[model samples]
Target: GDDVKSACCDTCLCTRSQPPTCRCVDVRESCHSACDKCVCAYSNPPQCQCYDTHKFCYKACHNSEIE
Candidate 1:
């Protein structure tokens, strides 16, 4: 089995001041409409996470050959 590189569409919110602080608050939001593989962390400068497990192919995911 091989892993896939999928791009999550989750965005982060950052302040406009100097040394802007960024965070992702949409924890329950899904990264892709057609895929159920994503994670949202509650750390400073938050990030959207993804897994390499087998999943349905979506536009945000790479490796079209797997589709």
Candidate 2:
């Protein structure tokens, strides 16, 4: 399957792919223009949620490759 590495689990903060690249784009009241129809990826670097802590990447609404 052409499964790309994306989407990490929020509970334990575990990634679903090899490289562990889970992106987090909050679909808040004011999201980006292309966010609605875009498919985001998950990328949890060491500082993915370190600063925020509460907001988890798994719960984010990511968008396409950010053309």
Candidate 3:
């Protein structure tokens, strides 16, 4: 499963549940680390591709609430 809010077109950008995870895929590679919309950014905010899936969360709620 992925972040409900991150999904676009009712489709998710993330493919698998792995570390450094992200949403969108590009001609060059599949993104695996981001915190915004499914697009690449190049600035402070340490921007990342829009994560169709959530990369981090509270441990307790993550397993019980989201699993």
Candidate 4:
């Protein structure tokens, strides 16, 4: 199932304005395996990962940094 907003493997950014502006900032590293769903979140470093829990080994997925 595809999401309403097309999934992509690029870093996206948005600006604060009347209508606001959004665009892909840069291309990220490709996943090692097939990526069914790509989830990207805007944050300090920005968060991007695969939506499938079983596909955590992909490059796009981030391993928990435990202290």
Tell me, by TM-score, which candidate is best. Answer: 4
Local distance difference test, candidate 2: 0.33
Using lDDT as the yardstick, the better of models 3 and 4 is: 4
Q: Give each model's whole-structure lDDT.
A: 0.39, 0.33, 0.36, 0.41
TM-score winner between candidates 1 and 4 = 4
Task: At residue 47, give the lDDT of candidate 3.
Answer: 40
Model 3's alpha-carbon lDDT is 0.36
Model 2's TM-score against the true structure: 0.21
Per-model TM-score on C-alpha atoms: 0.27, 0.21, 0.19, 0.29
| Clash pairs (backbone) in predicted model 2 | 21-42, 21-43, 22-42, 22-43, 23-41, 23-42, 23-43, 39-63, 40-62, 40-63
The CA root-mean-square deviation of candidate 2, after full C-alpha superposition on the true structure, stands at 13.1
The sequence of per-residue lDDT tens digits that candidate 2 reaches over residues 1-67 is 3242334332325346665633332322222332124333353321222212222344333333431
Candidate 4 minimal-lDDT segment of 10 residues:
53-62
Model 3, residue 51: distance off in Å is 7.9
In candidate 1, stretches whose alpha carbon ends up further than 4 angstroms from where it belongs are: 1-9, 29-67
The prediction achieving the highest lDDT against the true structure is 4
Model 4 over residues 1-67: C-alpha lDDT tens digits? Answer: 4442233433445556766655433433332234456566666456555543331121122233431
- The TM-score of predicted model 3 comes to 0.19
RMSD of 3: 12.5
Clashes of 3: 5
Q: Write the per-residue lDDT of candidate 3 for residues 4-66, one digit (tens) a residue.
A: 533222123443554555333321123333443445565553444443545443211221222
Ten residues in sequence with the least summed lDDT for candidate 1 = 54-63
lDDT of 3 at 45: 35
Point out where model 4 deviates above 4 Å: 1-7, 28-67
